[PDB]
């Protein structure tokens, strides 16, 4: 009854893109890839199954059967093998169809073409090589709502004004002449897509008996008759217009961490249009935002199980930034449309649309108090981002102050302006696992193979300054060997799986006539980066290296140490308790909280002088998504009392696990001692108990503590979740029951049933605060 009604995961495998792209490549054979793609995608949207759900007033969906996740063979296809039905993956009996597409799309798929290119193929855990040929790229926020007040028609004109009055093909990239035609070809695709619903919604009208539900869709057909093609005019046809731009991208590439930030900023002129004109009510607007959280869900993920350890089983980042600052004037933009957004998170309790708030000095204290109740209930949501510091990072990249003020976020914590960055290609490297390799000697304990460089013998280091060069020499190897892989993989993805439709919403892409992935990016700045996930464990161990190994303590010699972790404290269980009691990050120890700052300052030195993509340099994104588990489980033992095969850390500057013997103010004062201005978004989450946040103390102690954390300490991002540790243990022993539990992990909340085991038991260990 609570306004909205989401439903169940009674889903099966769907072949409405794979089979529809397969015969698109065959019917449009010979046309260049830029055109053979664009011609096939409009074939999809104009021909794919369509339906309108019940009591919903949004039409376009992310699949051809309710919640059945589509499959894209353009990116990969040879991962569907022998089981016929068996593990969250299921089909009816059509396995002979997947093997038919896999037979066709063999050696012509993204990874399928990619894995030949190399030659030898080094399977890895120190870098996500498996997640770079298999995972779809997005993690941006294009201007599909900042550049959709023009409409698809206004786009096709600029393309037509381009192919005619500026072409003169003097090899002005035949690739560019074909990109232009392609971009039109699926711009009419998003027209046919919404003109199919108009004919179907109008058909769903006469046979309808409820006259209010009849007029509900009779206006939707009138919306979709003008929403995608021409510029929108009303709040009901501005949302549907923006959404169809999110789908046209999804039909060309399963847009991963695509952000849709600032819906409280660009749906306002129509919001302020219909309301003050009595055309739409606040509850009606709260209906669409409710119907927006539901319809966005169907985009489930469908990747091989070999990555579920590192990417969970349903890690979706559909973030939207509510609140903020008016760019042209500097005042606050926190408005009622932001109030209805987190009002929607009440009546519908979906965990994917992140719904993030952006704090700033003169923000609206009322709609920030009301934001603290949204995380006071279930779900660890409105991930408060602090501006002021993030602005300095964007302004020092090159963006103008208006572009910087107007920033949103893409994916987890990546903050960036809308239509400028271009489909990021990330790199994971557990800089605690590097410590394992150099404390060894490039041996990769879990693998027991001399796969690294013999930088130096630990039993012959002599001094700490000698170690940190043997740690630099080892880290730099996995730099020019990891970047060098997905650098020329973004370039290689020009023979397969480029993002043509997404270029409709990247600046200068239309002008230079080149896609955002390869070339026509307006800013090749924050477009490639690294995620160190567990660098707290670097500082905690570096402290043990700096303090209490070299100089004093020869009993805990370099020999007694390496063997203790070799056997994982077995026979040394007395020692680990002392190291686990040594000063650890998360409290308020400058002697231990400053080494994690120098830690990032050690990573920011090597990678920032490494060129990237088409220009600029690699960034450093300390965030995480689930890569602490799949990497830590293969990262064997650490000096700071760690056990062998356990996770790294909970991302960026979050305290390790049970290391905060001090209150919440310390856990942020520590995390504040990080010069996080040049850090591409920090993932900082911590757990409170519901007795603290569900009272005035939540909107009094926290606010005074989170505002102080960002203004005095220069933080960037803070995200909370309230849930008892027993409630998670009670979910571990009853996982058949709590299959719809909202648990935060790392910049998102996902159902506990699709969460990995190593992530569950790790979430038990996170401390409780008051
Ligand atoms: O988000 C990540 O860090 C992993 C990733 C790698 C490649 C890709 O295409 C998508 C995601």
């Amino acid at each position: 009854w609570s306004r909205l009604n989401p439903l169940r995961h009674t889903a099966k495998m769907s072949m409405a893109r794979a089979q529809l792209i397969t015969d698109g490549y065959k019917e449009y054979e010979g046309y260049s890839l830029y055109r053979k793609r664009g011609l096939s995608v409009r074939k999809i949207m104009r021909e794919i199954p369509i339906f309108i759900d019940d009591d919903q007033l949004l039409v376009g969906d992310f699949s051809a059967t309710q919640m059945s996740p589509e499959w894209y063979p353009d990116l990969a296809a040879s991962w569907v093998e022998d089981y016929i039905d068996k593990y969250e993956f299921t089909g009816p009996e059509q396995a002979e169809q997947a093997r038919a597409i896999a037979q066709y799309w063999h050696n012509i798929g993204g990874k399928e073409m990619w894995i030949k290119y190399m030659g030898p193929e080094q399977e890895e855990y120190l870098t996500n090589t498996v997640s770079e040929m298999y995972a779809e790229k997005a993690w941006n926020v294009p201007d599909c709502a900042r550049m959709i007040t023009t409409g698809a028609r206004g786009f096709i004109e600029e393309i037509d004004n381009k192919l005619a009055n500026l072409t003169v093909l003097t090899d002005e990239d035949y690739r560019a002449h074909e990109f232009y035609l392609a971009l039109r070809y699926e711009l009419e695709g998003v027209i046919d897509y919404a003109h199919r619903y108009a004919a179907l919604a109008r058909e769903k009208a006469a046979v309808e008996r409820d006259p209010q539900r009849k007029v509900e869709l009779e206006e939707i057909a009138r919306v979709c008759d003008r929403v995608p093609e021409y510029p929108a005019e009303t709040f009901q046809e501005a949302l549907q217009s923006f959404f169809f731009a999110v789908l046209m991208v999804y039909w060309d590439t399963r847009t991963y961490g695509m952000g849709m930030g600032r819906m409280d900023q660009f749906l306002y002129p129509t919001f302020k249009k219909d309301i003050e004109r009595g055309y739409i009510d606040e509850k009606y607007a709260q209906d669409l935002l409710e119907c927006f959280r539901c319809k966005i869900m169907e985009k489930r993920q469908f990747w091989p199980d070999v990555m579920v350890p590192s990417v969970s089983a349903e890690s979706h980042f559909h973030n939207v930034v509510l609140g903020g600052v008016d760019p042209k004037t500097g005042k606050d933009a926190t408005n009622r449309l932001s109030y209805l957004f987190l009002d929607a998170a009440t009546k519908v309790r979906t965990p994917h649309p992140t719904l993030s708030v952006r704090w700033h000095a003169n923000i609206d204290e009322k709609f920030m108090d009301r934001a603290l109740e949204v995380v006071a209930m279930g779900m660890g949501f409105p991930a408060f981002f602090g501006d002021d510091t993030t602005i300095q990072y964007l302004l020092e990249r090159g963006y103008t102050l208006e572009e910087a003020r107007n920033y949103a976020i893409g994916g987890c914590v990546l903050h960036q302006v809308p239509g400028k960055q271009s489909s990021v290609w990330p790199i994971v490297q557990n800089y605690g696992k590097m410590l394992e390799m150099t404390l060894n000697n490039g041996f990769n304990w879990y693998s027991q193979e001399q796969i690294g460089p013999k930088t130096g013998n630990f039993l012959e280091m002599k001094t700490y300054d000698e170690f940190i060069e043997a740690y630099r020499k080892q880290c730099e190897y996995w730099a020019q060997i990891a970047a060098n892989s997905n650098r020329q993989c973004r370039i290689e993805h020009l023979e397969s799986f480029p993002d043509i439709a997404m270029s409709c919403f990247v600046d200068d892409c239309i002008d230079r006539g080149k896609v955002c992935s390869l070339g026509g990016a307006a800013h090749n700045d924050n477009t490639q980066y690294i995620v160190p996930v567990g660098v707290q464990d670097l500082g905690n161990n570096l402290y043990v290296l700096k303090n209490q190994i070299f100089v004093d303590n020869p009993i805990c010699s370099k020999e007694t140490l390496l063997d203790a972790i070799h056997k994982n404290w077995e026979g040394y269980e007395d020692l680990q308790a002392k190291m686990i009691a040594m000063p650890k990050f998360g409290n308020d120890i400058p002697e231990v909280d400053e080494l994690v700052n120098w830690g990032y300052k050690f990573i920011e030195d090597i990678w920032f002088k490494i060129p990237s993509a088409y220009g600029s340099h690699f960034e450093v994104a300390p965030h995480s998504i689930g890569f602490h588990a799949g990497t830590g489980a293969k990262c064997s033992a650490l000096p700071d009392g760690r056990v062998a095969w356990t996770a790294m850390s909970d991302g960026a500057v979050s305290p390790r696990q049970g290391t905060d013997t001090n209150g919440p103010a310390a856990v942020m004062c520590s995390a504040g001692c990080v010069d996080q201005v040049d850090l591409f978004g920090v993932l900082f989450n911590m757990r409170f108990t519901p007795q603290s946040l569900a009272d005035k103390s939540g909107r009094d102690k926290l606010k005074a503590l989170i505002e102080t954390y960002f203004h005095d300490m220069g933080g960037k991002h803070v995200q909370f979740n309230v849930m008892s540790k027993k409630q998670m243990i009670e979910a571990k022993e009853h996982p058949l029951e709590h299959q719809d539990l909202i648990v935060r992990v790392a910049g998102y909340s996902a159902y506990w049933a699709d969460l990995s085991t190593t992530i569950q038991d790790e979430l038990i260990a996170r401390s409780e605060l008051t």
Side-chain angles (χ1 to χ4, degrees), residues 128 131-132 135 139 256 426 428 529 531 623 625 627:
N128 61 330
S131 316
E132 93 175 16
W139 273 90
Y256 195 16
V428 301
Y529 65 78
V531 61
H623 71 264
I625 165 176
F627 272 89

Side-chain angles (χ1 to χ4, degrees), residues 28 142 242 275 333 341 405 411-412 435 441 538 613:
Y28 303 124
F242 151 82
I275 296 201
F341 259 122
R405 290 195 197 277
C412 189
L435 188 81
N441 200 13
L538 190 54

Side-chain angles (χ1 to χ4, degrees), residues 172 174 176-195 197-201 204-206 208 210-211 215 217 220-221:
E172 310 246 60
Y174 163 89
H177 171 82
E178 287 261 322
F179 154 79
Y180 270 144
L181 291 156
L183 196 57
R184 174 200 174 108
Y185 274 145
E186 47 201 279
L187 273 166
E188 31 185 320
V190 76
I191 289 190
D192 298 7
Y193 201 53
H195 274 194
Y197 283 102
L200 182 103
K204 245 185 179 61
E208 188 65 41
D210 195 353
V215 78
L217 46 91
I220 288 297

Side-chain angles (χ1 to χ4, degrees), residues 293-294 296-298 300-301 303-305 307 309-313 315-321 323-327 329-330 332-335 337-338 340-345 347-349 351 353 355-356 359-361 364 367-369 371-372 374-396 398-419 422-432 434-438 440-446 448-453 455-458 461 463-465 467-471 474-480 482-489 492-517 519-524 528-545 549-550 553-554 556-557 560-561 563-566 568-569 571-575 577-583 585-588 590-591 593 595-598:
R293 313 256 298 177
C294 320
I296 219 164
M297 265 304 195
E298 331 185 29
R300 294 146 59 78
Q301 77 161 23
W303 301 340
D305 172 74
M307 311 197 304
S310 311
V311 312
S312 175
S315 74
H316 289 331
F317 304 83
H318 291 306
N319 188 291
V320 54
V321 291
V325 157
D326 207 29
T329 54
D332 193 340
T334 314
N335 57 79
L337 213 162
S338 74
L340 310 177
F341 259 122
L342 82 183
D343 254 11
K347 313 310 294 137
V348 47
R349 288 161 125 249
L355 210 58
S356 152
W359 193 87
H360 73 97
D364 187 322
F367 297 106
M368 169 102 184
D369 297 358
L372 288 172
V374 164
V375 81
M377 68 190 200
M379 86 197 53
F381 262 30
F384 305 98
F385 280 92
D387 284 358
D388 303 329
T389 318
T390 60
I391 297 278
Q392 297 180 28
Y393 171 78
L394 291 201
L395 284 186
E396 77 171 58
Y399 308 126
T400 170
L401 185 47
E402 171 173 318
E403 274 166 350
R405 290 195 197 277
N406 194 15
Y407 85 77
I409 77 146
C412 189
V413 308
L414 308 191
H415 54 264
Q416 41 190 317
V417 316
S422 46
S423 152
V424 310
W425 293 70
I427 293 188
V428 301
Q429 284 187 352
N430 210 65
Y431 278 109
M434 308 279 176
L435 188 81
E436 141 182 303
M437 298 203 42
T438 167
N440 287 278
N441 200 13
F443 187 56
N444 199 351
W445 185 256
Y446 172 91
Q448 309 266 324
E449 285 184 13
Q450 192 76 73
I451 206 73
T455 166
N457 196 338
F458 186 75
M461 291 315 218
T463 172
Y464 176 76
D465 298 311
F467 177 85
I468 218 64
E469 191 86 16
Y471 191 38
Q474 175 92 198
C475 284
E476 291 184 28
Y477 177 56
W478 303 113
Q480 271 104 1
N484 182 272
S485 166
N486 74 328
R487 182 186 290 165
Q488 62 174 323
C489 188
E492 192 279 339
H493 266 62
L494 93 174
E495 297 286 346
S496 66
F497 213 83
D499 42 339
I500 314 173
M502 179 180 169
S503 301
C504 270
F505 326 97
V506 170
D507 279 342
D508 284 318
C509 261
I510 299 108
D511 290 314
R512 303 102 81 101
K514 297 183 285 188
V515 306
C516 48
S517 295
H523 279 264
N524 49 74
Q528 313 214 0
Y529 65 78
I530 302 85
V531 61
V533 46
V535 283
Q536 305 91 332
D537 295 281
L538 190 54
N540 298 326
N541 296 297
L542 274 185
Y543 182 79
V544 172
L545 270 303
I549 288 201
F550 305 96
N553 202 353
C556 187
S557 64
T560 40
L561 189 80
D563 199 307
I565 38 174
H566 272 35
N568 183 65
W569 316 110
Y572 297 90
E573 284 93 327
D574 314 348
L575 172 59
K578 194 59 67 172
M579 300 289 171
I580 215 178
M582 281 198 173
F585 173 97
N587 303 270
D588 198 336
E591 298 91 345
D593 305 316
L595 278 169
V596 317
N597 190 44
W598 180 100

